[PDB]
Design a protein around this ligand. Structure first.
Ligand SMILES: *[C@@H]1O[C@H](CO)[C@@H](O[C@@H]2O[C@H](CO)[C@@H](O[C@@H]3O[C@H](CO)[C@@H](O)[C@H](O[C@H]4O[C@H](CO)[C@@H](O)[C@H](O)[C@@H]4O)[C@@H]3O)[C@H](O)[C@H]2NC(C)=O)[C@H](O)[C@H]1NC(C)=O
Ligand SMILES: *[C@@H]1O[C@H](CO)[C@@H](O[C@@H]2O[C@H](CO)[C@@H](O[C@@H]3O[C@H](CO)[C@@H](O)[C@H](O[C@H]4O[C@H](CO)[C@@H](O)[C@H](O)[C@@H]4O)[C@@H]3O)[C@H](O)[C@H]2NC(C)=O)[C@H](O)[C@H]1NC(C)=O
Ligand code: JRG
Ligand code: JRG
Ligand SMILES: *[C@@H]1O[C@H](CO)[C@@H](O[C@@H]2O[C@H](CO)[C@@H](O)[C@H](O)[C@H]2NC(C)=O)[C@H](O)[C@H]1NC(C)=O
Ligand SMILES: *[C@@H]1O[C@H](CO)[C@@H](O[C@@H]2O[C@H](CO)[C@@H](O)[C@H](O)[C@H]2NC(C)=O)[C@H](O)[C@H]1NC(C)=O
Ligand SMILES: *[C@@H]1O[C@H](CO)[C@@H](O[C@@H]2O[C@H](CO)[C@@H](O)[C@H](O)[C@H]2NC(C)=O)[C@H](O)[C@H]1NC(C)=O
Ligand SMILES: *[C@@H]1O[C@H](CO)[C@@H](O[C@@H]2O[C@H](CO)[C@@H](O)[C@H](O)[C@H]2NC(C)=O)[C@H](O)[C@H]1NC(C)=O
Ligand SMILES: *[C@@H]1O[C@H](CO)[C@@H](O[C@@H]2O[C@H](CO)[C@@H](O)[C@H](O)[C@H]2NC(C)=O)[C@H](O)[C@H]1NC(C)=O
Ligand SMILES: *[C@@H]1O[C@H](CO)[C@@H](O[C@@H]2O[C@H](CO)[C@@H](O)[C@H](O)[C@H]2NC(C)=O)[C@H](O)[C@H]1NC(C)=O
Ligand code: NAG
Ligand code: NAG
Ligand code: NAG
Ligand code: NAG
Ligand code: NAG
Ligand code: NAG
Ligand code: CA
Ligand code: CA
Ligand code: CL
Ligand code: CL
Ligand code: ZN
Ligand code: ZN
Ligand code: ZN
Ligand code: ZN
Lengths: 694, 694
């Protein structure tokens, strides 16, 4: 038989291992020849595997690279202008790779050029609340200063945005061992920790969903009109560069001015973590000088798009996508994901060669330039938005399959909660001590829901990966799943070797997953989800799960507002409409579920499948969120303080944030009321898509 | 049998006559009790007629009314401040209606209040080219002047916008007998011409598709947040008032300054049509003073929405809609249309009572507040946009059925051209001399296509009626049809009694259509279109007709650009991408048509019906046109110079308009190139929705 068990049984850990080795021997940086060659290899192999069509979709997008003959570095400079200490020009390469060429040195992609010189201020994680503490409580002014911030907690582009608005003239990002060195584990190559010379690459854009900075709204095809660089979307205005903790120690050790305000500001280095500005007495005349010479360049990128045509509903698309470009070798990010996608394609293709096809069309994507701002997925979605609008059932992302070996991590739309619970109850746990137990059992034990007993945690979607355009712009039901660590406070910081040269095949094979059993489990989860979405007669979405969360989110946003009772009285701020809409959605969803269970009629079925498919779509507002036109989902958006985190009722949340500091409370509370109206209307309008159609 | 002939045969001229009489005995001004009572009557009757459900959908929108105890008028004032001539406070009511109460006096809806006093400048029709002539050629400055303009040629809101930007401090609109008095016909009540005391009411908003000025984007429901009046959309900034030609003569007769520049500036009154500014020598010290005291008021409006549920595809909607609110009695506008809709509902209901249902759902709408800016249709579409997006097959409008007795007039999407041709070939011509001939034959003879021999003229859609939100915002295939006059130069001016108290039942019964045969023909066209759209197994849309027009429109926009060859050389302005996209659309449409003719499989059928339905949808750009976010169709928009006219490739057209006057030609030609890219992309993306789906 050709059922899900047949699909799942065909997946093999040893194939995932072979693919991971094959994809990680040389760097695959976006825009480079190496990565184009890998695209062509994947295209050829997906064809061999049995897909109906496999094409490359190319775009010409703005990328950023260091200047090979004018390298980036930071100095401490004396009053005579002598550079007395310099940060490293490259990470010491790992054993056996010291002769690999074209390893891009650490840099912050899209930094502007400059050579700012100044006094340092230390800003902890450079979060919104860290700058509030500095400027409001400690009365420290960052204007004209170079800020030094530790990586962790929030997306680095948010740090840079925050520093820019505080008036900084430059930002130095570093990896503190508090966040990137687990106690009792050795540094690479002897363990999975970051060494003092390791550095985390990554872009510092704030694109808010736009994709290529030069072509917002439209694909960057051959005839595209491009914005001038001065009008580009999302580019930082001050130079930025990342460094390792050996170099950070040298910059932080001489810091003077004010003591850290409390222990949450101190990392694990042997320095005081003084906030500054500037250095202690003896070194008061020394400064820090940055030298950044990176260039932004329009560069061709290539997505591979494979199609497995549906037997019954070929005009309904289930998409499994993940990226292929990496900063260096991509041992975890992304090739641990890409190897899983490759084995999933091979398995579906095996069934296809035996005469099977899925009910609905499955599209498989190998995206390019994810590391430079989700560029490949977003340009392709811009090109194909009308097809995706009207035909897109679901998107499952497939970046890194592992970031630890402890338990499952899942973020997805509520419409997928029941699917994930049911699938994980049918899969074997790979965990020590849970032999013979379901993955649902191990996951629920290790990562309990904060809300419900005997349920696992599933988080909201924000941004930070290639599902963003599908979910936040287009309103296609999306999900993601991987294996993770037990390090809760580090959930947005990345594993220690994230975006470093040290993330290699050997890292994964020696220290993360020697038997590739966690990779196999992730392949079963991602592939099983795609299988069910593409083959179930009724789409496997439960609208009642959205009703449950909407009440949760309404209670939460009401509780934030209720911190300001006198203003709610003064400005007549009522959440009554939003609770009414949620109540209506709950009632209508319950009645729809009854009809769905109670309805031989393929028109009623498809009518009902269309209601299920367009339900996520109903939460899209074609006017977008305030000043973020490409974030259009009214229930979820990436947090304005941390792109990696999802925020619920984002338009209301942002209207309320720090509202006590707004100079015109009438205007500010008016906009809260406006956002309550938009949210109440949108929830009611989504509910009504589930009513009887006539 | 229950087929289209059965539906068409059930329609009766004598019923349309009875309904028209019933709907025109008292005024039905939007927001008044009279119009709410008519809504309730229609709701009850549509229920009686057999519809499955009939509901009222109400909204609270900004309307505008004169002040009953502080009337609007214009004076000529002497230097001592004595008002020596006053315009009328009301139109002399027609015979037998001199005791009807609540006839709203002539006013321009949404005029601000004020009492500006100044010198007159005469501006012909106040078109963009009339102001170019005044300011650029004649060197006459309208700043601080009161402008007097004749109605005709373009939407009055465009006149007001133009006058405002020329610096006018007020606008007086009047009906010149050149445009509103056909030679050799008597004035009402003895014929269909406008008497010297008649006045055309009408709104002067420039909403650009927004609907209620206080709630753009969202329905004006009970909990809506409203903009403050200072932020309202589309309100004029200077007072405006309309007058009849007896009063105009008194204002124009003393005009001095410059002679009219040529004969196209002279109307038919016995005055010189001097442009001014101000009066001739003896009267040079007299001024004109306006007194406008109208108020804008949020007021409840009511749409009636009737549903006839489809037997096979109940989640596909064919909509027949037209408005019910009138300025006064609405003899032609709108009740000649509403009477036709009423008889169409009665006929469909007769079939329903015999056991028939249409294949797809038919929705019938009686819209409110069309006269105040398409408010009822637009608020309802805003409320239901997600259902309409995903389920809307077509919208057929049904305002005035007659504006003459000469031949048919049709404006519709190219997707409906073949449907209209085929239907009209099967209907009887009602015209004298064409007894026994088809309507297609008479129509083609009287209104030949400028492009093709043996074809009739069908025009583009712009705005001016309730189809606007469905077509220009949502991208639902739309059409309209009525009987018209033989007066080509008057095609946007309105029939002589347009929006006057004199448009009564007697006007229609005596002078337009005594046998109600033209009304019956229009009912057969509108109803036949709805019947075919709701019942044909394959949707009756021909994508190849869009391919033909797209080439026409591309040739036309290229030819406009080619008036500037040196700039096209300098700025490398190429239309190659747009012609490539049109060529691709033509090829793909041809192949789709082959499959459609060549494909027992209801999934392939519906898949193909969905491709047909979403084809109009593909021309929508979710970012809208420049500074007009609610006009989203890339091929058509209402002309920026005349809301009644449709413009093709509007984004390119507006980028090119008057480009030789732009101060920064680099920037201006850059934006032309941007608009070519958007249009080429959009045409290619629409073409690709017709490709094989996988
Ligand atoms: C959740 O679904 C429910 C339906 O079960 C839906 O209920 C609707 O609520 C609206 C708003 O309360 C009701 O609107 C009323 O409609 C009547 C006519 O039916 C009007 O007369 C009312 O207006 C009068 O009263 C107002 C309030 O005092 C005054 O402001 C106004 O000036 C008038 O005096 C009012 O518009 C509507 O009837 C019901 N529909 C039902 C029960 O079928 C509710 O809106 C849904 N929630 C959301 C957020 O959409
Ligand atoms: C109408 O449909 C046709 C398909 O029948 C479609 O043709 C496509 O045209 C584009 C643009 O010309 C082609 O893009 C090329 O793709 C190749 C790889 O396939 C690239 O190597 C090309 O780039 C090189 O050449 C460029 C031009 O000199 C340089 O600017 C560039 O730097 C490179 O040197 C180029 O991107 C595409 O291959 C075809 N696809 C086909 C034939 O299948 C056409 O685009 C459609 N029209 C519209 C408006 O969409
Ligand atoms: C906007 S352009 C982004 C470009 C690039 N993207 C990433 O590197 N993404 C990594 C981030 C890893 C650290 C944060 N972890 C989470 O956010 C997280 C949430 C849920 C689940 I299930 C798994 C992981 C990733 O998603 O794996 C960048 O950020 O530089
Ligand atoms: C933006 S709010 C509009 C509110 C209101 N609308 C109308 O009165 N509409 C009348 C206009 C009649 C004169 C112009 N004729 C055409 O445009 C025309 C084109 C094609 C065909 I087939 C038939 C007629 C109408 O459509 O009948 C207004 O204009 O004050
Ligand atoms: C990754 O695997 C691919 C596929 O097996 C290898 O590419 C093949 O290499 C052989 C020998 O050079 C050629 O004959 C084939 O044409 C290639 N097939 C393709 C590209 O589809 C590639 O060598 C492997 N890479 C590494 C680093 O081991
Ligand atoms: C840090 O790097 C800089 C740049 O290479 C070094 O400064 C240069 O030193 C050379 C040789 O002494 C001079 O000829 C250059 O003019 C210097 N350039 C600049 C910009 O100062 C510096 O010596 C290095 N510092 C340390 C401690 O290694
Ligand atoms: C997850 O599994 C549950 C348990 O089998 C499914 O819920 C059952 O669905 C069937 C078919 O509609 C009903 O007859 C049962 O009453 C349901 N049992 C319940 C709710 O306890 C559920 O549909 C599955 N979720 C999916 C497929 O998304
Ligand atoms: C228009 O026609 C309607 C429907 O026949 C008339 O309304 C009816 O009037 C009678 C007598 O007053 C009542 O018994 C019914 O209840 C009404 N029916 C409705 C409202 O559905 C109305 O009188 C006619 N109007 C004019 C001006 O002739
Ligand atoms: C035009 O109308 C105005 C306003 O009613 C008339 O002016 C008024 O005349 C009365 C009686 O003589 C005075 O008491 C008012 O003070 C006047 N009002 C204003 C604003 O001037 C005027 O007489 C009318 N002119 C003509 C020619 O009929
Ligand atoms: C308008 O009528 C024509 C003439 O009957 C229809 O075109 C025919 O359609 C049938 C069915 O697909 C084909 O077999 C013929 O070859 C067509 N004849 C032609 C093109 O000359 C046309 O489809 C009708 N238009 C509609 C229904 O929108
Ligand atoms: C990189 O730096 C070199 C050496 O100074 C310079 O010649 C070249 O212009 C730079 N390349 C760029 C800016 O792309
Ligand atoms: C910070 O410093 C600059 C002076 O260089 C000043 O313009 C700015 O207002 C200061 N901000 C605060 C909060 O002191
Ligand atoms: C794998 O799990 C073991 C046992 O709990 C742990 O000691 C090891 O550190 C884990 N590896 C990683 C990379 O987390
Ligand atoms: C209308 O005019 C009267 C009489 O001057 C005045 O009392 C009232 O305020 C006005 N009504 C309005 C502005 O709605
Ligand atoms: C028109 O008149 C005013 C002076 O009242 C002036 O400000 C404006 O620039 C003038 N425009 C032209 C074109 O003369
Ligand atoms: C109706 O047609 C006749 C004959 O052509 C014409 O004389 C008459 O004016 C028409 N009526 C109207 C209102 O156009
Ligand atoms: Ca783009
Ligand atoms: Ca509105
Ligand atoms: Cl992922
Ligand atoms: Cl109409
Ligand atoms: Zn990644
Ligand atoms: Zn990454
Ligand atoms: Zn009308
Ligand atoms: Zn009208």
């Amino acid at each position: 038989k050709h059922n899900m068990k047949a699909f799942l049984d065909e997946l093999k850990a040893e194939n995932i291992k072979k693919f991971l080795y094959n994809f990680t021997q040389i760097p695959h940086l976006a825009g480079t020849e190496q990565n184009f060659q890998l695209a062509k290899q994947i295209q050829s192999q997906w064809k061999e595997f049995g897909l109906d069509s496999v094409e490359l979709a190319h775009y010409d997008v703005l990328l950023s690279y260091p200047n090979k003959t004018h390298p980036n570095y930071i100095s401490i400079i004396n009053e005579d202008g002598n550079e007395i200490f310099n940060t490293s020009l490259f990470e010491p390469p790992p054993p056996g790779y010291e002769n690999v060429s074209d390893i891009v040195p650490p840099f912050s992609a899209f930094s502007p050029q400059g050579m700012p010189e100044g006094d340092l201020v230390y800003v902890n994680y450079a979060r919104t609340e860290d700058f509030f503490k500095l400027e409001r409580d400690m009365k420290i002014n960052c204007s004209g200063k170079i800020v030094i911030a530790r990586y962790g907690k929030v997306f680095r582009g948010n740090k840079v945005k925050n520093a820019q608005l505080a008036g900084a003239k430059g930002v130095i990002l570093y990896s503190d061992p508090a966040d990137y060195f687990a106690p009792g584990v050795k540094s690479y190559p002897d363990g999975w920790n970051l060494p003092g010379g390791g550095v985390q690459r990554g872009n510092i854009l704030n694109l808010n969903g736009a994709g290529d900075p030069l072509t917002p709204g439209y694909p960057a095809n051959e005839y595209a009109y491009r914005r001038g660089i001065a009008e580009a979307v999302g580019l930082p205005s001050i130079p930025v560069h990342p460094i390792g903790y050996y170099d950070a120690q040298k910059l932080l050790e001489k810091m003077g001015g004010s003591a850290p305000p409390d222990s949450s500001w101190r990392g694990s280095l042997k320095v005081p973590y003084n906030v500054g500005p500037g250095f202690t007495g003896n070194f008061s005349t020394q400064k820090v000088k940055m030298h950044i010479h990176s260039t932004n360049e329009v560069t061709r990128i290539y997505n591979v798009i494979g199609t497995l045509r549906g037997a019954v509903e070929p005009d309904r698309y289930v998409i499994l996508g993940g990226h292929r470009d990496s900063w260096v070798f991509g041992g975890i990010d992304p090739q641990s994901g890409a190897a899983v996608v490759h084995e999933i394609v091979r398995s579906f293709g095996t069934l296809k060669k035996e005469g099977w096809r899925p009910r609905r069309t499955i599209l498989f994507a190998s995206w390019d330039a994810e590391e430079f701002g989700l560029l490949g997925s977003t340009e392709w979605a811009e090109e194909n938005s009308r097809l995706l609008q009207e035909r897109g059932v679901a998107y499952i992302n497939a970046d890194s399959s592992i970031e630890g070996n402890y338990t499952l991590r899942v973020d997805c739309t509520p419409l997928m909660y029941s699917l994930v619970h049911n699938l994980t109850k049918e899969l074997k746990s790979p965990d020590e001590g849970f032999e013979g137990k379901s993955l649902y059992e191990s996951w629920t034990k290790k990562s309990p829901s904060p809300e419900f007993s005997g349920m696992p945690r599933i988080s909201k979607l924000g941004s930070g990966n290639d599902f963003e355009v599908f979910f936040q712009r287009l309103g296609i039901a999306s999900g993601r799943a991987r294996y993770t660590k037990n390090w809760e406070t580090n959930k947005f910081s990345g594993y220690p070797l994230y975006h470093s040269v040290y993330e290699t095949y050997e890292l994964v094979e020696k220290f993360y997953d020697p038997m590739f059993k966690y990779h196999l489990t992730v392949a079963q989860v991602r592939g099983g989800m795609v299988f069910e979405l593409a083959n179930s007669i009724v789409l496997p979405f439960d609208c009642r799960d959205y009703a449950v969360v909407l009440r949760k989110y309404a209670d939460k946003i009401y509780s934030i507002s209720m911190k300001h009772p006198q203003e709610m009285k003064t400005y007549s701020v009522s959440f009554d409409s939003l609770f009414s809409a949620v109540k209506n959605f709950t009632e209508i969803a319950s009645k729809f579920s009854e009809r769905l269970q109670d309805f031989s009629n393929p028109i009623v079925l498809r009518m009902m499948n269309d209601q299920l498919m367009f339900l996520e779509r109903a939460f899209i507002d074609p006017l977008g969120l305030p000043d973020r036109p490409f974030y259009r989902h009214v229930i979820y958006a990436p947090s304005s303080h941390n792109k990696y985190a999802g925020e619920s009722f984002p338009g209301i949340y942002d209207a309320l944030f720090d509202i006590e500091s707004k100079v015109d409370p009438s205007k500010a509370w008016g906009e809260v009321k406006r956002q309550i109206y938009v949210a109440a209307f949108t929830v009611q309008a989504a509910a009504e898509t589930l009513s009887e159609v006539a």
